[PDB]
Each structure stands twice: as C-alpha cells, then as structure tokens.
Design a protein around this ligand. Sequence first.
Ligand SMILES: CCNC(=O)CCNC(=O)[C@H](O)C(C)(C)COP(=O)(O)OP(=O)(O)OC[C@H]1O[C@@H](n2cnc3c(N)ncnc32)[C@H](O)[C@@H]1OP(=O)(O)O
Ligand SMILES: C[C@H]1O[C@@H](n2cnc3c(N)ncnc32)[C@H](O)[C@@H]1O
Ligand code: MET
Ligand code: SF4
Lengths: 538, 531, 38
Amino acid sequence: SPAELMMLTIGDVIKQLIEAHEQGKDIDLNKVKTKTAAKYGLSAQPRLVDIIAAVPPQYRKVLMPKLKAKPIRTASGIAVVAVMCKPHRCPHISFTGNICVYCPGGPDSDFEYSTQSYTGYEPTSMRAIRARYDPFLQTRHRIEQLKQLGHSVDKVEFIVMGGTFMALPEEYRDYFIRNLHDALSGHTSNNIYEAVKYSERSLTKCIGITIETRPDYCMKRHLSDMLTYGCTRLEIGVQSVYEDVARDTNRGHTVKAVCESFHLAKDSGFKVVAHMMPDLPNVGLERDIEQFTEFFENPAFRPDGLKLYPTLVIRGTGLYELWKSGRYKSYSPSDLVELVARILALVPPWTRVYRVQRDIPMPLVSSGVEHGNLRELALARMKDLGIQCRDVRTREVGIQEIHHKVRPYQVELVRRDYVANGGWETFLSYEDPDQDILIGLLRLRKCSEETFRFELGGGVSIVRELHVYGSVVPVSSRDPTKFQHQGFGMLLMEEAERIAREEHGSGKIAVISGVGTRNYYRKIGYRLQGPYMVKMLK
Amino acid sequence: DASFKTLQAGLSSNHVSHGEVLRKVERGSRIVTVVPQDTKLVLQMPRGNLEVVHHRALVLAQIRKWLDKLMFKEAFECMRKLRINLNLIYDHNPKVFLGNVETFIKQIDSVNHINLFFTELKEEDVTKTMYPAPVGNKIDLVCDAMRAVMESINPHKYCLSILTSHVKKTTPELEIVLQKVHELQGNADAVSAEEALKYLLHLVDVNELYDHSLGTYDFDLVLMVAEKSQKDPKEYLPFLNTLKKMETNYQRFTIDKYLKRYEKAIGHLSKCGPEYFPECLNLIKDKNLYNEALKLYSPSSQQYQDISIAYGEHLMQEHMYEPAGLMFARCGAHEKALSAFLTCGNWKQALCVAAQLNFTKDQLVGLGRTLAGKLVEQRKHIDAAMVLEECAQDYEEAVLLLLEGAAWEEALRLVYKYNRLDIIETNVKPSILEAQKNYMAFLDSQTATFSRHKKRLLVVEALSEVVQNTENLKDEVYHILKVLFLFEFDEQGRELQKAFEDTLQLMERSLPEIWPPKINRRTQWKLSLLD
Amino acid sequence: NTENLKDEVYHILKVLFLFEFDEQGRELQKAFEDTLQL
RNA sequence: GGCCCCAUGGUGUAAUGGUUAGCACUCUGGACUUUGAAUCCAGCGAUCCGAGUUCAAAUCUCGGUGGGACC
Ligand SMILES: CCNC(=O)CCNC(=O)[C@H](O)C(C)(C)COP(=O)(O)OP(=O)(O)OC[C@H]1O[C@@H](n2cnc3c(N)ncnc32)[C@H](O)[C@@H]1OP(=O)(O)O
Ligand SMILES: C[C@H]1O[C@@H](n2cnc3c(N)ncnc32)[C@H](O)[C@@H]1O
Ligand code: MET
Ligand code: SF4
C-alpha cells in the first residue's frame, strides 16, 4: 500500500528533523520532503497536516515554532471562535411577510436547513448542522480542530452568529450562555451565575463575547441584561444615512433610533460595529460617496468598528424580481474597485475595518463579482492612485510583518481626541510612526451627563477598551522575543489614570472587562463592583 | 544659536534630512499650539480632530539639561515613559557617570526599576548610532561597581538585585548564584528562599540551569533544582546514585562527556589512570581532539608518539600529503622522531625518508624511478635531472626530458660531460625547429581567437585572459632564439620575433579600445643578431 | 608587493615547523595575517 | 554478452547549439474576525554521472551509473 509508504516517509522526516534539532541543525522542510518522496517512489508531496499529526509530545514542545500552519490565524493576538444559534424568525415579520427586501433565505425560504441572512453553505454552517446547533459540541470540535494546527489557546474569544438574539425566549438564551461558559470551565452548573463564578477561576481565560442586534432592542433593560453576560461589542446594521431608504428597504425603523442607540451604548461603555451597504436602489454613485463621507464627517456617528457588504442580488427576494425586471442595475467591477479605493482613503485612523465582501457561494448570485478577493484589488488601485490608507488592521505589527516583513525600530506614544454622540472621546497608542506600524492602543472617555448606570454617577470616567496586537503568548511564558509582555499596558493604565484624575477631573475610575481579565486588574489594586471593575481615585 | 547660512542649510540641505530634527506628520496637517515646559505640540487635521505629539528634539534637549543638572530620577521616569533607550544615560558621559553610582542608586531606590534597568544593558552606544549629537568591559565594570556599594548599603532587601547583576554578566556564573540560593536556603526583612527561586526560574529556563548544576560538581544543588524539574525520581535518582558511587576523577570525566565538555573529560581521564588512555584515544580520534591531547601528554611518552601518529594519519584521510608524511617523518613536533613511511614523496619527504635512517640507498634505484615518473608526470622534468645524477648514467634520458621541458643548457652540460656528442644534432635541432613552428601555430590561433571574440564583444570579458596568456612567453622565446642561433636558424627565429611583435602591437593597440590588466614593459625577447 | 611572502613563507613555514618551534609559526604568521586587511 | 532504447520538478510530461527548460498533477501562502479542503490570486519544484569536443553544449562524441526487449 502507498499509505504505509508515505507513513515511512513521515517517520524518516521525523527522525531526520529531530536529529537536526538535537545538534541544532537547520534544514528546509521542502528539501527533505522532496528527497524522501523521490527516494521512496512517491508521485505527490506529503501534506503538512499529517506531518504535525505524528510528532511525539516531548518534541511538539519545541517543534511547533517550525511547524505551525497559517500563522495569520493568530497574527492579531487573540484566538477567535465562532458559534451558531438556532434558526428562528425575525420580529418585524409581525406586520407582514417581509424579512428584508435584500435579506437571503430565512427559516422558511425554500431551504431545508438554513438561517436568516445565511444560505447554509458556510463552513460554520456545516459545522452547526453536524452539531445540530448544540453549543458545547460545536465549540469543543472547533477548538480541537484549531489546536490541531499547533496553536496556543491561552486566550480565546467568542462570536455568536444567528439572525436575532434579543428576540428569543429568555430560558433558552440562559441555557445557551451557561453551556458556552461550561465548555471552557469544564464544570457542570445550574444557572448563569454559578457558571460565571466557576469560569472566573478557569484557565481558558475567556475575554469576552459580542452579539448582533437591531435598535429596537436597545433600551437600558437589554443593556443591563447584557451586562450580566460579559458582552463587549455589538452589531446593529445601518445600511444607510438616509431615512427614506429605510422605508424604501422596508427596514421598519428610523435612523434616529439608531443614533440614540449609539449614544446610549457609548455612554454605557460597549463597543459597536456598523454595517454599510453600497450600491443600493435609488442611490447614485455620488450618493454613496457623499453618505460614506458623512459617516465620518458627522460627530453624530463617528463609530468604532466598520464592516462593508456590497449589494448582491439573489433569487427569492423582491430585489431578485426587480433586477429581473431590468430595473435595478449594478456597477461594473472597475466602478466597485474605484468606490472601495476612494472609501479606504477616508477611514479615520482610530476606526478598524474587519471584513470586506460576503462569503456567499459563487454559483448563486445574479450579480456576484468574479473576485473573491477585493481588498487586494483596492490595494492595487490605491497604489495606482498613489494614496494610502490608515486602517488599524493594516498597521498592526502582525499583518505588516506577515505581508511586508518590517521590524519596528522606534516606538513612541500618540494621543488624540474628538467628539461623538456628545462624548469627549480619547484615544491613546504606542506605535512606530516612520513605518506607521502600531503596537498598542487604548480607548477612554468621560461619561455623559445623562447615564443609565448609577454606579457611574459623578466623578466617573469609563475606559471602553484596551488591547495590544501581535500573537498569542501563554500567560506563564514571558519573552519569545515579540512584544506582548514587556509591561507596556502598565504605562498606559497609569497615564490614563493620571489624565482622568487631572484632565477629566473625575473621582473614581470604572472599566468593563472580560470574566477572566478581572484578575489582571486585581494586580493593580482594582476591586469588583457589580459587573464593573473599579478603582477609587483619591 | 543659528545663523542665516546655518538655517538655510538645515532647511534645504539639498532636501536631505537625517536624525532628530525631522519628524513625519499626516496629510492636511496644521499647527495649533506648542507646549513648552511639557515638550508638546498640538495641531488640527482637516477631518476635524486634534493631535498631540512629543517631538524628539525638545525632549532630548531637556534630557541633556537634566543630566547636566543631575536629577537622575526625573530624566529616568520622563525617559522610560516615552519608551526611549536607557543606555544613553551611560552614553552621555560614561566617565563622570561612574563617579556618582551611589547617588544614582539613592535617586532610584526601587528594586523593580533597578531590575528593569539591568535587563536592557547593551554594549553599543546609540549616541553614535541612534541619537547623534546635534553639535565588553563596560557592562561588567559598571555592574560590579554598583553591586559592591549597593550590597554594602543593603544586601538583605536587594538580594534579587545581586542575583540579576551576577546573572547578567558577560558570562553566566550560575554556580555562585546557585551557591547563594543554597546558602540562603540553609539560613533561616531579607529575601526568602522560594522568592529568589521563582525570581530566577523565569529568568533561567531551569533545565539548562539543571545541566549547569550537574556541571558544578555538587549533588545537593542538583537535588534542589531537579525538585522542580518534573522528571520522575524513579528515573534519575538511581542513575544519580550510580554516578555518585563511581570514582571521583572518573565522575569528572563521565559528567564532562555527558555534558559534551570533551576537553575537561579528557583532562580528567588523563590523570584518572593510564589504563583508560587508549579509550581516550578513541574519543579524541572520534572527536578529532588529537591537538588538545598533545598538551596533556609530554615528550618521551609512548602515548605521545602514538597520539602524534594518530593525528598525522586519521585526520589526514584523503590528505596523505606534505603535512601527514612530513610529521610522520617527524612523529609530531619532534624533528625526526620517526621514519620508514612516505605517502607520495614530493621530492622532499621521499629523500627525507630514504636518507634519514637510511633504509635503501640509490643502489636500490627504485626511489629514483618513482620520483622521476611522479614529478615528470607533474610537469617538473628536473626531478630526473637531479636524481639520475645519483642514479645510473641514464643522462641521455635526462637530456631527452630536458629537451621536452626546453631545458637546453642542461642537455648541453650532459652531452659535453658524458661525451655523448653523437646526439648533438640528431634530435634537438629538428625538435626546436618544430617548437618554433608550433609557436607560430599557437600564436596565429591566439590572434584569430582574440580578433573573433573582440568583434563578437563589439557586436553589442575573456579577452584579457588570452591577452595575459600571450605575455608569458617573452624570455622563453628570447632564449630559444639564441639556442636556435647556435645552429644558425636566424631566419626562423626572425619569423618568430616578427609574429610575436605583430601580435604584441595588435593587443597593445586594442587595449585602449577595450578600456583591464596592465602588462609589463620590461620583458626582453629580442636579439641584435636576431634583429 | 608583499604577495611574494604571501605563500613563500607560508610554504617556508615548514623550516620552522620541522623544528620544535611550531608555536613561533603564528608568532610570525601575524604579520602575514596583518596584510590580509588592506 | 553485446546490440539497441531511456534517464527534465516529488510525479506526468513539452522544449532544444546560445542570455531565460514551458506546461501538467502536486505542495505552500493571502484574501478570511465564517474556510487546512471551497473561489480567486500568488508562490516553491528540476535535464543520471564523469570525460570530451564546440566561441558556446542537456541535445554532437566517448565513458560510467541504473533501468528496459533480442539469441
Ligand atoms: C479585556 C478583554 N480583552 C483582552 O484581554 C485582550 C487580550 N489581552 C492581552 O493580550 C494582554 O492582557 C495585554 C493586551 C494586556 C498585553 O499584556 P501586557 O504586556 O500589557 O502585560 P504586562 O507586561 O504589562 O504585565 C505582565 C503580567 O500580565 C499577566 N497576564 C497576562 N495575561 C493575563 C491575564 N488574562 N489575566 C491576568 N494576568 C495576565 C501576566 O501573567 C504577567 O504577569 P507576570 O508578572 O507573571 O509576568
Ligand atoms: C450582516 C449585514 O449584512 C446585511 N446583509 C445580510 N444579508 C445580505 C445580503 N444578501 N445582501 C446584502 N446585505 C446583506 C445585513 O442587513 C446586515 O447589515
Ligand atoms: C445579520 S443582519 C444584521 C443584524 C440584525 N439581523 C439586524 O439587521 O439588525
Ligand atoms: S433584520 Fe437583519 S437578519 Fe432579520 S431579516 Fe432583516 S436583514 Fe435579515
């Protein structure tokens, strides 16, 4: 059998490389791959997955630095895990049989198993289908699969899929959340609070969750509810900056409610990511440019997280027939490239882009662009125009090194501030300006005069979030060279505290945190109060 | 402190900038307000936000001010908060700085700060590398100099500082640090045992320190460190006891060979007993440590001569050449401590072997035959011309070899000494005439190839090679001319000279065209009778 | 220039190696080493 | 034992006296904060060995290596 022959080649490679390691000899993996394949009469190269699949642990301890696959999965600095909710119905349908004019198949839209705004062919979708949407099974399977690639899971985070979450029966969501927390804790519980207390002392060190929603479920009741879950960031879906479009799109709400939702959430202390929807009906190209410029020029919005999704006519929706009637037309691909290139030149430095384009399978869209890759095309176009972008994701150390191999040389501090939703926002960072490469960031502001949480009443400044990018470093490990444990955060904390004490003129500092991360602040003398970590300022 | 010329220079500098003066900014930037006494500047950008920056120049100026004004802590904090290199504090004035160590320590007076200061020492000076002025011994020296006084004032609550200071020396003196840890463990304000233990565990990545403890030649140290090594005592403890039981110097040899310190292993095993000497040989023949053992043993030792011949033979595999056979006839550093062995006999080791400790005389003329064949095959042809003098009267064969090698006057000496006059003209005269003819053939080929490749180059390297090939035969032709002229071949030699001169002029005139070596103009190849 | 002594002594070194003063080889080779850095 | 024939990426292959050996399977990376596997894009693989000749040689010669049928 050939299979045992490849196995023998694998063992040969293993012994050669461990021998090289013992004396510290350096060898090209591909070279020995080729030589072993030739000397054993192999017609095809060996897969690296199987190469990792046989190392003994007393060597996996140190061989991973030369064995990890697709390092970009940790090139940010934090592991990411996605989970799927049970399919259900959106609330608005209470009026008529309208989900959204552009939304894909929902619970009952000619799909055996699917979800609202999801065809059902995403790898996450098949994972959920096999898992029968069970949280625990799918999360264990996914984390195991990720660890197969020899990646540290010291710090992890959770993102939840699904159409709508706030609009679900409470007992179900509590069951779901406690199952998630028990997945990392390994301790069977009975309520949310028990799972919280147990996960406090776990070692997986969860650092937060983010959920999608819509402005209807944005009153302070739901915010307090989410405070009990440790959620950090939120998704809304804006789709426009013009009220008329909403009723044109049958969205079923007002942009105003979105604006007050933004203001209230920012006052509370969460983070928010918006969704932008270019090339819409009754929208000219100049309309798109103007509205996108407005999206940052207005102090009303000035959001933090940005996501973009170009229009995609798909069978089943009303827009399918509208285009089919030859009345809704898209742009040429060059037009889209120019649009994106212009947009990227406009992003303020603090904002971070997370994704571009949808992940829908190709042979389904009546106007789907050929290119699965668009950011690269935009990059080519903006090289052609000789104008650069300043997105966070494009100036962190991880991506910049993995795509250009540039080493920071002189890192310094930088401070900026602006106004948004009435807030006195403030942004701090360490970064190297000459290469414009960034390492660490912090977002801190003064709380608004009107608030929902009385714990913030008077002399209180909230620090929304703090983060240093890079790659995962185990909490016990100190220096694999790199930049994740040099004490950088300490300086930012002390300086932010000093600013709040003097410039803010407050009297007590509060902060949101992940369930595990609380212990970190304990090292600085921060004590708990409700769901908020806090320190007295006098 | 600038001038119109200075300012205009710093402004334009042919639009070339370098160092602390320039600083990149963003598009659409402006200026709002400078902040002296805090070294800031604030500006507005078009989108409608603010920006505050600390430019280097002001910060460095104030740092120099403070260093001259000696408040070290203020510069220290203002300089660490901005993520600036610490080494500059020494670099600014290394001499005077050393005279204020205690004052600096009292200025800092914080263990964590001293620890962080130690963990970033570097040899190079950034004032000459990273922070230009706008106008090995050092690290250990400063480390010990400050450690002495800081231990003097307080060792008890600054023990970890001492630990790091000795750890961060040029070489890791882990042994003494382990000694301090163990003695503190034995002893009962001051730092405790587990405290320093953890304070070093992260610092050392224990397993290497465990190996070093093995090297330190003490079991108890190995015991404590291995307590945290997580390895099964069922594994190493029987092995450790086995090592303990066996002999002291043999313990040393075995621990060095287990720690690859082969030099110490051989040093120990040399005195551990002569009976193990051959085994040592194997190691120093497996690890090629012959030269090392040369110092361990002494002359007049059979071990010394054996290891010498081992050096000359085993390492010289594929190198049975001048060094091998040479020091074989030498048996090492001694001049002639061995004989009766020659590898190839390159005219020197052969006669050295044969004559010194004379085994076979040239009456056993096989040596002459081998030398002649070998070196003549090596295009020498003088080997026979010398050895056959000591050998039989085959002078005529020597004459033939000299003629093949163009050694004319030596053939003349042989013919006029051995009275072999019959061969005065039978073969040498046509041979040298043919030599002139083939000289013409080769010269014509050189001319043709040179012209061809020069034209090929001119269509749009190796020409210089042929050029240098042509200049080698000047005096060869010169003496061949007179050699022929005794037989009065002045016409053929004149042809030779004319062809050589024409080719010489061809390359001489082509040389400026191409541009590149320079030939010599003091080569004589012409004769007045020839001319 | 000095290239004549580049190999000459480097092959006349033997007259000293063939004696007991092997250590002296480097003790002169330094000069032959020095000109290497021109 | 000779005659012949063959030796190009890890494999399947084009190509040929001159500035670059082209494809194909395979493997690797990014798009991707939904994907090792998908879609696209990008990238890493090479003339059996030694002697010859030829300005120049994988293609002309010889030798060797190993393999393939002949009586
Ligand atoms: C709030 C939810 N979001 C996140 O947590 C984002 C991910 N967080 C991180 O990657 C890191 O915590 C940071 C971004 C803060 C970078 O770490 P940073 O360099 O600032 O830490 P410092 O170097 O200043 O301090 C080091 C200490 O932090 C400790 N530490 C690291 N991670 C954690 C953690 N989850 N919880 C508690 N302590 C931690 C380390 O054990 C270390 O202690 P040590 O004395 O034994 O070395
Ligand atoms: C997730 C974000 O993408 C939008 N969205 C969901 N499905 C589609 C689709 N087929 N086409 C365009 N936008 C879509 C949602 O309305 C939300 O804004
Ligand atoms: C998945 S669509 C975006 C989130 C949510 N369904 C909304 O439209 O508000
Ligand atoms: S609210 Fe969002 S998920 Fe629900 S139907 Fe509309 S677009 Fe789809």
